[PDB]
Amino acid sequence: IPCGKFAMYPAWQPDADFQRQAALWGVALREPVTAEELAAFIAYWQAEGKVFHHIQWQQKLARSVQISRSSN
Amino acid sequence: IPCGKFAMYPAWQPDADFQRQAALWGVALREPVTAEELAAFIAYWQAEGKVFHHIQWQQKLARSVQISRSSNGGMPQRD
Q1: CA distance B41 to chain A (A)
Q2: Between chains, do A71 and B40 touch, taking CB under 8 Å as contact?
Q3: Where is region (C-terminus) located (chain B)?
Q4: In DSSP terms, which residues pair with A52 in a beta bridge?
Q5: Nearest by CB to A43, which of B46, B64, B67?
Q6: What is the phi/psi pair of residue B78, to 5°?
Q7: Which of A33, A45, A67, B68 is the 20 to 30 A CA-CA neighbour of A26?
Q8: How far from each other are the two terminal CA atoms of chain B, in whole angstroms?
Q9: DSSP for B19-60?
Q10: Which class is domain A1-72?
């Protein structure tokens, strides 16, 4: 895991226990995040150019996948 | 905003009167689209690659947000 704040990068990965951490932030991911879902998140946030800590990135991913799965 | 059909891109935004337009497409929205909701939509469709006119992107955003909020009394989840 990287320390400090960083911008999004193509090889970024959430933690191996992301689903457990997602539930901690109130997000129930009954099936794991797919490569397609993670790659979409990464490509978008690379464009945004914002920097966060790894934990804040994982929270945004959780909420993003929660919204995208609850739609359509 | 590009002319014709275009692929979703990170800087895209619906129109300033989106909530009105959405209602006239039959989609009530109790609150404006949030920044989290817009970013999830754009990220998803920027990766899907399909192209639509701006009006169709807006119609898709409207119904996507209505469906997503429907389990929460029609309210967005707070950040």
Answers
A1: 7
A2: yes
A3: 1-72
A4: A6
A5: B46
A6: -75, 145
A7: A45
A8: 27
A9: HHHHHHTT---SSPPPHHHHHHHHHHHHHH--EE-HHHHHHH
A10: mainly alpha
